[PDB]
Amino acid sequence: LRLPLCFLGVFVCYFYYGILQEKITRGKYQETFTFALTLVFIQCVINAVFAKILIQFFDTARVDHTRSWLYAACSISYLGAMVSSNSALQFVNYPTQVLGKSCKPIPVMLLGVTLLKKKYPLAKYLCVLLIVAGVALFMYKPKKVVTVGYGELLLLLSLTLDGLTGVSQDHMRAHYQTGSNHMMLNINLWSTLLLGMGILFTGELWEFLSFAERYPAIIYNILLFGLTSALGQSFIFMTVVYFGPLTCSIITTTRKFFTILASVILFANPISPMQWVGTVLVFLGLGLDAKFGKG
Ligand SMILES: Nc1ncnc2c1ncn2[C@@H]1O[C@H](COP(=O)(O)OP(=O)(O)NP(=O)(O)O)[C@@H](O)[C@H]1O
């Protein structure tokens, strides 16, 4: 049973996803792409329909034991995190976003330690040193010699909301014995409903066609971005059931490092050497916990 599709499928698709996301966000159209909610709405609905058409061809005996409200709260947290992350690209540069967003464990770790009252032996005190050193050497100058950018605040709030969603997921999985496809399916429906409800009130989507009228070449790319996102979500779901979940961490780390490399190469984003070694340090620490002492 050769399974090369476990690597290629989740690698090439997410690589195209990242390249498209960078293309349509920082594209020098002049009217910058200030709209951050429409694309996440489209992505959510596309991935939801793909989830339905996928579960239709999978096991049916499973019965969703999860209650309604937990999915709703997890959906608000998840959609808020995604919206805040995407809206921040107007200030910061792409490589900084994909690096900062990648340090997911630290928010979850601190939230669990302060709230869940957990314990981790010399693992959340050792790899954290490498992670924080890398982050605080890459984006930061030596001594602020050569108010912080508002995008950093948005990224920090995104990390906080993402940690909240993660802890919520952990609870609904442990104490309620939820599944994998059902969870993502329900949270997607709730998130898209809430996003649409808010959007119609915001008075922007009614005004969003005119922007499309200005540049008719912003429809195919966004559709492809949604399609690849949904395909990648389905592929990662299919992987996680095989070889356990530990492979997912290494897969994502490799994908994000190659995404950094492609971003710096293709789009000519300047980077300094002393800065450049910053990303490798944080990436090495990231996933090292998964390889040794998962936590
Ligand atoms: N059991 C799972 N394992 C991995 N990813 C999952 C799982 N369940 C849901 N996902 C989603 O799969 C995506 C993984 O991509 P990513 O945004 O990089 O998260 P990640 O934690 O950094 N990578 P990963 O360790 O595989 O979850 C996210 O959108 C997760 O919400």
Numbering used by the authors: 12 to 40, 46 to 162, 168 to 316
Passage from the reporting paper:
The endoplasmic reticulum (ER) cannot synthesize ATP but must import cytoplasmic ATP to energize protein folding, quality control and trafficking. Here we report that human SLC35B1 does not bind nucleotide sugars but indeed executes strict ATP/ADP exchange with uptake kinetics consistent with the import of ATP into crude ER microsomes. We have further determined seven cryogenic electron microscopy structures of human SLC35B1 in complex with an Fv fragment and either bound to an ATP analogue or ADP in all major conformations of the transport cycle. We conclude that SLC35B1 operates by a stepwise ATP translocation mechanism, which is a previously undescribed model for substrate translocation by an SLC transporter.
The SLC35B1–Fv–MBP fusion complex was optimized for cryo-EM with or without the addition of the non-hydrolysable ATP analogue adenylyl imidodiphosphate (AMP–PNP), which was first confirmed to produce equivalent STD NMR signals and transport activity as ATP. Unexpectedly, the ring-shaped map density implied a nucleotide conformation where the terminal γ-phosphate had arched back towards the adenine moiety. The Q113F mutant structure adopted the same conformation as the wild-type structure but with minor side-chain differences located around the phenylalanine residue introduced in the cavity-closing contacts.
